[PDB]
């Protein structure tokens, strides 16, 4: 067959022989220098674990040195290692999202913490806010005892952090708030006691590279989005069932799903992988998880049409209004929610024709989840036409902005990378037919060579968390590729 079909089969194969016997693909997180600096600041100040700390020092000097992140965490690895403003600028430069004033208290307040600058001269208030409230409320800990006025602090403040006290692995596999939660409350008397058993489990978490990673994996949106990827091949392999088994097993009560194993908050991202991939391998067989997963992406619905990510009244975000449209368009009962989220979609498209950035750092993330909606759920008449005109203007900004070598990289002037690209072919796939040397020919060549001879894929990563910080699952790079060149042939 074509040259991309035999990429396909290669990587293909790749996937299948990744899922192990229990369902899952494996999905470990890199180790990341915002986390790695704080578990070194929090172990150097309880002058504890001193081969850790010498391992994580190693390898802040070492990234630092050859793989730089963006200048926020390298003002936080200076400042532990040992100006402020300009890497917070530049970190959260032109960073277009309903976040940035929050994450702009946040992330002064971490550098703050670590005594790279002072901290923001705001009413305490500006603190308050399940999404980031413990991370939130232990940085104005942090802040009522960095500025001298620890009577600040109350009983409820204090409370919010009693998860991090707890043994093994972070509460929702979050290093970075079990890190942020144990800096606040080495401060309080009455919490040390339970602190020298958690430093144990924090130190004994580093990876082989002497790093702290931001999250223990991905585990359920990888496999999700690899089931989904493996069921839209010709003929889908036989694992997909026990994926679907090994996700479904792991619903939440609420019918949701969150993004590893042990994660109880759901998210609708990791929710309508799920949903899309049981639909297509397990519609009978995991009817009842079905089911209850339209019932938790019904309940967060927003007012407006839109779907937030992860509670009703947070904002709508167009990503995850697209997402969900699809995931529920497959019953005819919800037409009513989808045509209004397809709606919702249509009226937040730029003037350029792209969407947003959210958890992914490319534009080509949400043109795909928007795309796929614009063109999939059913529709006739005029919407059909105001939602081919939408489509139409998104297709036309990866053309406009493709690149020589025929991918896309994080923006317009970026390198290409493939998964970046992977999600360009994704929305490309449902414009007009592949043509030598069009938008959509070019970009399958260049994933075509881009392929390793493992059959894999390594990209630089897209997934943002806390927005906008890069991190890093290397597993999602042949998967998001694999769901490209499933999607396109």
Same mark, same amino acid.
């Given at each position: 067959?074509?040259?991309?079909?035999?990429?396909?089969?290669?990587?293909?194969?790749?996937?299948?022989?990744?899922?192990? $016997?229990?369902?899952?693909?494996? &999905?470990?997180?890199?180790?990341?220098?915002?986390?790695?600096?704080?578990?070194?600041?929090?172990?150097?100040?309880?002058?504890?674990?001193?081969?850790?700390?010498?391992?994580?020092?190693?390898?802040?000097?070492?990234? =630092?040195?050859?793989?730089?992140?963006?200048?926020?965490?390298?003002?936080?690895?200076?400042?532990?290692?040992?100006?402020?403003?300009?890497?917070?600028?530049?970190?959260?430069?032109?960073?277009?999202?309903?976040?940035?004033?929050?994450?702009?208290?946040?992330?002064?307040?971490?550098?703050?913490?670590?005594?790279?600058?002072?901290?923001?001269?705001?009413?305490?208030?500006?603190?308050?806010?399940?999404?980031?409230? %413990?991370? %939130?409320?232990?940085?104005?800990?942090?802040?009522?005892?960095?500025?001298?006025?620890?009577?600040?602090?109350?009983?409820?403040?204090?409370?919010?952090?009693? $998860?991090?006290?707890?043994?093994?692995?972070?509460?929702?596999?979050?290093?970075?708030?079990?890190?942020?939660?144990?800096?606040?409350?080495?401060?309080?008397?009455?919490?040390?006691?339970?602190?020298?058993?958690?430093?144990?489990?924090?130190?004994?978490?580093?990876?082989?590279?002497?790093? %702290? $990673?931001?999250?223990?994996?991905?585990?359920? @949106?990888?496999?999700?989005?690899?089931?989904?990827?493996?069921? =839209?091949?010709?003929?889908?392999?036989?694992?997909?069932?026990? %994926?679907?088994?090994? =996700?479904?097993?792991?619903?939440?009560?609420?019918?949701?799903?969150?993004?590893?194993?042990?994660?109880?908050?759901?998210?609708?991202?990791?929710?309508?992988?799920?949903?899309?991939?049981?639909?297509?391998? &397990?519609?009978?067989?995991?009817?009842?998880?079905?089911?209850?997963?339209?019932?938790?992406?019904?309940?967060?619905?927003?007012?407006?049409?839109?779907?937030?990510? @992860?509670?009703?009244?947070?904002?709508?975000?167009?990503?995850?209004?697209?997402?969900?449209?699809?995931?529920?368009?497959?019953?005819?009962?919800?037409?009513?929610?989808?045509?209004?989220?397809?709606?919702?979609?249509?009226?937040?498209?730029?003037?350029?024709?792209? @969407?947003?950035?959210?958890?992914?750092?490319?534009?080509?993330?949400?043109?795909?989840?928007?795309?796929?909606?614009?063109?999939?759920?059913?529709?006739?008449?005029?919407?059909?036409?105001?939602?081919?005109?939408?489509?139409?203007?998104?297709?036309?900004?990866?053309?406009?902005?493709?690149?020589?070598?025929?991918?896309?990289?994080?923006?317009?002037?970026?390198?290409?990378?493939?998964?970046?690209?992977?999600?360009?072919?994704?929305?490309?796939?449902?414009?007009?037919?592949?043509?030598?040397?069009?938008?959509?020919?070019?970009?399958?060549?260049?994933?075509?060579?881009?392929?390793?001879?493992?059959?894999?894929?390594?990209?630089?990563?897209?997934?943002?968390?806390?927005?906008?910080?890069?991190?890093?699952? $290397?597993?999602?790079?042949?998967?998001?590729?694999?769901?490209? =060149?499933?999607?396109?042939?």
């Amino acid at each position: 067959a074509t040259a991309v079909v035999r990429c396909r089969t290669r990587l293909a194969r790749r996937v299948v022989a990744a899922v192990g $016997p229990d369902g899952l693909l494996p &999905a470990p997180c890199e180790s990341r220098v915002l986390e790695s600096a704080l578990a070194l600041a929090l172990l150097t100040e309880e002058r504890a674990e001193a081969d850790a700390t010498a391992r994580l020092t190693a390898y802040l000097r070492t990234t =630092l040195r050859t793989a730089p992140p963006d200048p926020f965490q390298c003002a936080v690895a200076r400042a532990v290692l040992g100006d402020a403003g300009t890497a917070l600028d530049a970190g959260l430069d032109g960073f277009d999202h309903f976040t940035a004033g929050r994450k702009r208290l946040m992330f002064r307040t971490v550098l703050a913490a670590l005594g790279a600058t002072g901290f923001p001269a705001v009413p305490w208030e500006a603190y308050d806010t399940s999404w980031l409230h %413990m991370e %939130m409320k232990a940085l104005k800990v942090l802040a009522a005892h960095g500025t001298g006025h620890p009577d600040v602090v109350r009983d409820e403040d204090w409370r919010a952090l009693l $998860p991090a006290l707890e043994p093994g692995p972070a509460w929702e596999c979050n290093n970075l708030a079990q890190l942020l939660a144990l800096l606040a409350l080495r401060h309080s008397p009455r919490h040390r006691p339970a602190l020298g058993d958690v430093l144990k489990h924090v130190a004994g978490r580093l990876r082989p590279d002497g790093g %702290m $990673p931001f999250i223990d994996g991905m585990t359920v @949106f990888t496999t999700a989005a690899a089931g989904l990827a493996l069921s =839209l091949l010709p003929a889908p392999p036989a694992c997909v069932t026990p %994926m679907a088994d090994a =996700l479904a097993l792991r619903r939440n009560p609420d019918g949701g799903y969150g993004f590893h194993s042990g994660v109880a908050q759901s998210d609708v991202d990791d929710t309508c992988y799920v949903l899309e991939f049981l639909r297509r391998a &397990a519609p009978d067989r995991h009817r009842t998880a079905v089911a209850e997963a339209e019932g938790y992406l019904l309940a967060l619905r927003n007012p407006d049409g839109g779907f937030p990510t @992860f509670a009703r009244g947070t904002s709508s975000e167009i990503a995850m209004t697209a997402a969900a449209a699809s995931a529920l368009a497959h019953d005819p009962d919800r037409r009513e929610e989808v045509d209004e989220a397809v709606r919702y979609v249509v009226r937040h498209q730029r003037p350029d024709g792209t @969407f947003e950035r959210s958890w992914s750092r490319n534009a080509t993330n949400a043109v795909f989840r928007a795309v796929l909606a614009l063109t999939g759920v059913a529709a006739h008449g005029e919407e059909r036409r105001s939602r081919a005109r939408a489509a139409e203007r998104a297709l036309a900004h990866l053309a406009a902005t493709q690149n020589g070598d025929g991918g896309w990289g994080h923006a317009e002037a970026e390198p290409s990378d493939p998964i970046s690209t992977a999600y360009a072919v994704i929305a490309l796939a449902r414009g007009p037919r592949a043509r030598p040397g069009g938008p959509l020919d070019r970009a399958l060549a260049y994933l075509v060579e881009r392929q390793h001879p493992d059959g894999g894929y390594r990209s630089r990563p897209d997934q943002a968390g806390p927005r906008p910080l890069l991190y890093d699952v $290397p597993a999602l790079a042949d998967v998001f590729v694999l769901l490209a =060149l499933a999607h396109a042939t």
